[model samples]
Target: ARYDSLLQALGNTPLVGLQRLSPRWDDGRDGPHVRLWAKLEDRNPTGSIKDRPAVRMIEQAEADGLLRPGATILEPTSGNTGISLAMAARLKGYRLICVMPENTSVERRQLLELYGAQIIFSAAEGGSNTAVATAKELAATNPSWVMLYQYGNPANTDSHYCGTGPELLADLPEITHFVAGLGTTGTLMGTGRFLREHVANVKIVAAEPRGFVPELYDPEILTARYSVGAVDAVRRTRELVHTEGIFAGISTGAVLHAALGVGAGALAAGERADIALVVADAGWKYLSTGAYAGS
Candidate 1:
C-alpha cells in the first residue's frame, strides 16, 4: 500500500532568484547592490506559506493524541491558513470548520469546500481578528473540537525554524538580509533566529501593515500590539496599486511597500542584500477591497 499523501509534499519549495527585480546582478552596479527575490510560497500545497504551519498543527495534534478519530478541527483565518488546514484535515481524515471574514474571496470558500471544510463567516470589517474570536468561541463551547490557535502557538514559530528557515538558508547561503511581512511574526522570528545563528551580519527587517493596528484584529487584549519575535526593525507601507502594479490584500500591500524601502536602503549602502517576503495569498482574493481600481 503506497501512501502518497499531500502531507509528504509540504515544504522544500524552489528558491527562485528574482532576475528582473534584482538590480545588483542586472544594472552593472559597482561595489555592492541588493538582490531582490520572492520565494514562491504561493506554490505550496495551499498556495501560501501557511501550508507549513497547517501541516505541523495537524501532525502535532495527532502525535500528542489530542486528536482522535473523527475529531473536528476548528480554526480562524483570513484565507491562506484556513485553506491549508482544510486541505490537511481532509487528507488526514478529520472534519474541519474554518471561521473567516465575510470579505474573504470566493476562491477561499471554493478551496475549503474542495477539501471538505465547513465555513463560518464573521464580520469582514473585523478581518482576521474577528475570525479568530469566532473560532475560539466555537472551540470553547465544544469539547470535541480542537483548535490550532496559530496566532500564539509555539508550533507556528517552530515550523519556520525547523523547516522553512533551514531550507531558505541552504538554498541562498549568501543571503545578507531578510524582508518579510508581519502577520503572526512566526516567519520573521523563526527564520530570523536560524539566520542569525548562521550569518551574524544578516539584517532582519519586517514589513508591517500601515495605518491599521494589529490589535484591532486580535480579539485578546495583547499588550504589545503588533511587534512579534526576532523583528529587528519595522517598516510600514500603504500603497499597493499606485506604486508596485501589484494589488495585494491589506496586509500584503504593507509588506511590499516596506520591501521597497529595504531595497532602496540596501542599494544606497552598497551592500548586497537578498530580500524575501511572504506572499500570504494572491490579489484575486482582495477584489472586494477596491484596491485594484484605486477607489
Candidate 2:
C-alpha cells in the first residue's frame, strides 16, 4: 500500500462486480448466469484509465531520447489523456501542450491549466478527429516539440498489453468478453491481444461515440462494435452512479453500453458470460457539461 512515487502507483486497478446492472448475477449451479464486471480504472492517480498510456508514452519517449529535459510534449486528446499527460509532464519537467476540441467539458480545460498545460482548441464539429489533425499539423511545424501521438503509438497499446491485460486475467480468468470505449484503440489492441493469446473464445468489443470514427480503432481486433450516443452515455453514466455507486465519466457509459449488449446476447444464447467493462474515469470532470444534472 506504499509507493515511492505517484507514477509508480499506476495500474493494478480493481475489478468490481455489477450485480444490479447485470442481466444475471447468478442462476443456480447448473445454469448459465450472465455477469458484468467493471474495471475501476478511474482509481488511477489522474482519475482516468488514460494514466496507463500517458505514463507509458512518456517513459517510452524518455527511453528513446526523444524527450529531452524541459522539452515540450504535444498530444491530441478529448480530455482524460491531456489531464494525465499534464500531470506526468509536470513531474518529469516537460512542457505539455494539448490540442483538444472546443466541446470538451469545462473541468477538463480547468484541470489542464491547473497542471500547467497549454491548450489549443480545434473545431468541435469534427470532435477528436479534428483535434488529431490540428495536433498533427502543429507537430509538423514544431519539430522541437515531441509529439507522442497516442493514436499510432505502440507504447499506448503496450501499456495495456503489459498492465491492463494481465490485471484483467489475474482478476477474472473466466472473462468471456472485454469491452471499452474506442478512442486510441490502445486498450482494446493490447488487452484483446493478450486475452486472445491466453483465453480461448474471448470477445473484444468496442463502444464508440455515434458520429466519430476513431482513427485508433482496428476492426480486426473487435468481435463487435456499438455506436453510443451522448444521451445514452449520460443516462448509463448516471445509472452506474445510482445503481452501482460507480461515478464514471461519459465514455465509461459508452463502454458499459457495449458490455450490456454483449451480456444480453450471451443471456439470449444460453451461454454463461463474464463480461469485463472499462470505467475510463470518474464523473468529476464532466459536472460542468450538465451530465450529472437533473433527474
Candidate 3:
C-alpha cells in the first residue's frame, strides 16, 4: 500500500457488503440471495469517484498535447468534480478555472481554493445546467483555455472503463447490476461498458438526479432507470450511515435509494442479485446542508 505520490493512491477501493441495508444478505437455504454491495469511491485521493476521471482526463489531455506545463484548465462542475480537478491541476502544475453553481457547498469552495484553482460562480437558477452553459460561453470567448468539458469527454468515461470497471469486476465477480448516480454518465458509460463486456446479462442501472442528458451519456449503456428526489436522497443517506456505518455524500444517497428499489424487484422475482452502489464521495462537503440533522 505504498505509493510515491497522492495520485498513485487512486482507485482500488473497498467493496463491502451492506448486510443491514440489504433485503436479504444470503439465501436462507431456499431461494436466491439478493445482496447489495457498496463500492467506496470516496476512498480515492480527492475523496470522490471523480478523481479517477480527473486524473485520466488530464493525463489524456497531456497525452494529446492539448495541455502544456503551467497551462490553464477550464471545467464546469457541481462540486466533487471541481474539487477533484482542482487537486489534479495543482499537482500537475496546471492552472484551473472552475465554473460552478453559486450554492454548491462551503467545503467544496474551500477545497477548490485550497487546491489553488480559481472559482467562477454562475447563476444559481439551473445549478450545473447553468454552470455548463456559462463554461461553454467562456470557452467560446477564451480559446486559450483548455476546457475539459467532462460532460462530453471520452477520457472521463475511459477512466471508469479502465479503472472503475476493472476494480468492480475484480472485487465482486458475481456482480449482477451496477448502480450509480448519473451526472455526465461517465461512470455509467465507462463502468457499464466494461462490466457488460465481462459479465453476461449484467444490468447497468442509472440513479438520476434528473439531468440534461450529458454528451457522455450513452443510452445503450443503461439497462434500467430510477429517479431519486432530494427528500429520498437525504433519507437514504441517513439510512446508509445508520444502518451500514458508511458516511456518504448527498448524491450517494440517490444511488443507494435506487439500489434498494432494485433489490425490491429482485426479491419479488426470487432472483439472485449482487448490486453494487457507487458511494461517489464523502459527507464532509455536504455536512453544511444540514440534511443529516437529528430529530
Candidate 4:
C-alpha cells in the first residue's frame, strides 16, 4: 500500500477475473473452465505497462553511466512509453525528447508536454517505424543525446521477465495462456519466456494491428499470432467498458480479442484454461481518437 516513491510503485498490478467476458467461467465438473483474467497494467504510476520498462531502461542507462545530469533522453514511442519516460526523466533530472507518430492521440502529446518533454512529430503514414527512423537521425546529429532504443534493448525484456511475469505467475498459478500486443515485443518475449519455463503447455499469443507486423516480434516465443483490425479493436474496447467496467486502450482491446480467441479454442477442445491478457493502458490518452464515441 505504501512505497518510498512513485517509481517504486511501478509494477504488481491487479489480476482481475473477467467473468462477464470469459467464454466459460465455470464448466462444472465436466471440464476446465475457460476463464479469462485481465492484468490491469493500466494501474501503473503512469497508467500504462510501459512504466515497467521505462523506469528499467532509464535506470539501466544511469547505472551504465550513459546518462549524466541534464542529459537528454531520446526515444521513439507511440504514446505510453513517451509519457512514462517523460515522468522518469523529470524526476531523474534529464531532459526528454520523444519522436512520436503525428497521428497519435492529442492527449498523449499533451501529457508528454505536461511532463516537461519536447516532442518531434514523425510521418503518420508509417506509424511508429518512421518515428524510430527520425529518432535515429536525431540521435546521430545530436551525439550527446542518449537513445534508449527500446526495440532492441535487453533491459526492456528484463523488466517484464523480472517484474510482470513473476507478478502474473504469483497471482495466477493456473495460467494456461498469456496474451499481449506485439509492439516492441518486450512484453511477449519477456513474459512468454518466463511462463514457458514455469507453466506446462502454456500458450503465448501476440495480438497485432491488421497488416502490420512488428519487427521486434520473435516468432520463436509465440504459440500463435492473431491480426486484429482497428474496428474490431474499437468494438472490443467499448465492450470491455460496457460488459466488464474495464476502460482500456484500443491496443488492450486487440489483446483481449486474442485472449478471447484462445479461450474459445480451449472451450472447443474441452480443456480447462485460464487465459490472462495485458491491459497495456487506460483509454484516457485516446479520448480524442474518436474510437470511444457513440454506441
Candidate 5:
C-alpha cells in the first residue's frame, strides 16, 4: 500500500455522498432532489486541498532546477497554502519562508511553524495583498531563493485537472453540477475543465466572497487578478454563521452558498439534478472567524 513517496499520494481524495445533509436538496423533496457529493480534500496530508498543488509546485520547481537541495522557498499565502508548502519543502529538504497577513487564524500560524517555516507577517488591514508584495520583494532581494507563486502558477490548476477531475468522474459519472469556492480558481479551472470533457451537462458554479473576491485580490502580486477562464456562474454570500451547521472557512462557505443557489435555480426551472459536488477544503483552519457559532 505504500507509494513511492508520500507526495505521490497527494491527490485521489475520497468522495463522500451528502445524502443526509442534503436531504431536501438531493432527495427531490424540496429542491428538485439534487445529488450532492463532497470531494473531501482535507483528508490529504496537509489537511487542505492545497496539498495537491503544493506537491506539484515543488516537483515542477525541483525538476526544472528552479528549486534545489538547499534552496529556500519563499511565497505569500493566506494560510492553507503556507502550511502545505512548508511541509512539502521540509520533506524535500528546502528552507521555507511564508509571508502571510497578520489576520490569519492562529492555527495556520502554529501549523506553519510546526513544519519549520519562518513566518513573516504583513499588515492585516492590507490583507493578503500586502503579504504577497512583501514576499515578492524578499524573493527579489534574495537571488538564491525561489518563489512558488500559487496565484499565477499553472501547476496549481493542472494538479486538479490532472488528478481531482478524473478521480471524481470515476467515482460518480452522473455528476450534473460542480461547486467549489473560488480561491485561486485552481479547483474550478482544473476540475471544471476535466468534468466538462466527460459530462456535457455538467454545470460549473463558483462561490465568491460578497466583497473581496480572491481572484481579484491583488494585480501586482498576481499577473491576473481573477481567473478569467474559470467560473461559468458566480454566487455571492455574506457569511456562513447561519443555522445550517455547515461551518467552514470563508471560501468553503462561499462555495456552499453558490451550490445552494444553483440548486434553487434548478428548482425554479423544474429540473432535477442527479448529482452536485462540492470540495470541502478544510475545517480546522478557520477557528478565528467564529463561523461555527450559531446565529
Candidate 6:
C-alpha cells in the first residue's frame, strides 16, 4: 500500500468482463462468444481516465523544458481532466489553474479546490468551448503560464498510446472492438491507434461532439460511430449498477451503451466478438447532477 505517492500507483488497472451486460457470454454449447470487457480507469488516484493524459502531459511538458520548478499549468475542462491535472500538478511542484464552464459539477469544483488548484468559471453559453476561449485569452495575457491544452496536445494522446493501449491488448488479445466517448478524443485516438496496428481490422467506435481541435483525431481509424443520447445513457448507467454492481459516470454509460450495440451487432451477424470499453470515472464527481438519484 506504500509506493512513494498516489502517482506511483497509477498503472495497470483492472479489466473486468461483463457477464450480465454482454448479450451472450458463452463459448462452448451455445453460439459464438460475444463478450464485453470494462476497463476500469476509475481505479486511479483521481478516479478517472483523465489520469493517463494528465500525468503524461505534465511529464512531457517538464521534459520538453516547458514546465520548470514551479511553473503554473492552465487547462480548460468540463471536469475530469482538470481534477486529474490538479492532483498531479500538486505533487509535481507545479501550480494549476483550471478554466471550466459555470455549470460544471460541484463535486468536481470541490476536488479541484481540495487539490489547491485555482478555478475560473467561464460563461455557460458555449459550454467548454467558451471556457477554452477564455483559457486562450488568459494564456495570451499571462505569458509565463503554460496552457497544456488537452484537446490537441500530442502528449495527451501519447500517454494512452504507450500505456492504456498496451495494457488492454495484453489483457484481451482477442479484443475485436474498442469504444469511447470522445470529448478531446485522447482516449479513442491514442488507444484506437495502438489497437488498430495490432489487431486485424479492429473496430473503433465513439460517441462524440465537436469544439475540440483535431491534432489527435483521425476518421480513418474509426470503423463506425454509435450515437448515444442522454436518456439511454442514464438507463444503462443504472443497469450497470443493478446488474454488474459497477457505478460509473454518465459518459461511461454512453460508451457502455455503444459497446452493447457492438456486441448485439456481432450476435446478429453470428460472429465471435470481444468488445472493450472504459469506465472513464466513477459517479462521485457527478453526484450533484442527480445522475444516481432516481431509477
lDDT of 3: 0.90
Assess each prediction's global lDDT (C-alpha) against the native: 0.68, 0.90, 0.90, 0.90, 0.70, 0.87
Per-candidate TM-scores read 0.80, 0.96, 0.97, 0.97, 0.83, 0.96
Off by over 4 Å in 4: 211-216
Model 1 global lDDT (CA atoms, 0 to 1): 0.68
Quick one: RMSD of model 1? Answer: 6.0
By summed lDDT, the worst window of 10 consecutive residues in model 4 runs over 210-219
lDDT value for candidate 5? 0.70
The TM-score obtained by model 6 is 0.96
How would you encode candidate 3's per-residue C-alpha lDDT over 191-295 as one tens digit per residue?
A: 999999999979999997743768888898899889889999999999999998899997889999999899999998889999998999989888888988972
Worst 10 residues of 5 by lDDT: 222-231
Q: Model 1: clashing residue pairs? A: 129-217
Candidate 4 lDDT (Cα, 0 to 1) = 0.90
Candidate 2 lDDT over residue span 123-225, tens digit each: 9978877898899899999899999989889899999999999999999999999999877899999999889999999999989888455555667888887
Segments in model 1 whose C-alpha atoms lie over 4 Å from true places: 1-3, 26-29, 211-253, 282-295
Model 2 has a clash total of 0
lDDT tens digits, residues 1-295, model 6? 6798888788588999999889999885567989999999899978998888988898888899988978898998988889999888878888989999988889988988899989999999988779999999999999899999998898888888998999999999999999888888888888999998899869899975325555677777788887788888888888898899999998888888888888888898889899989888888887788878885
Q: Once superposed on the true structure, which residue ranges of model 2 sit more than 4 Å away at CA?
A: 211-217
Tell me each candidate's RMSD, in Å, in order: 6.0, 1.6, 1.1, 1.5, 5.6, 1.5
Off by over 4 Å in 5: 23-32, 211-248
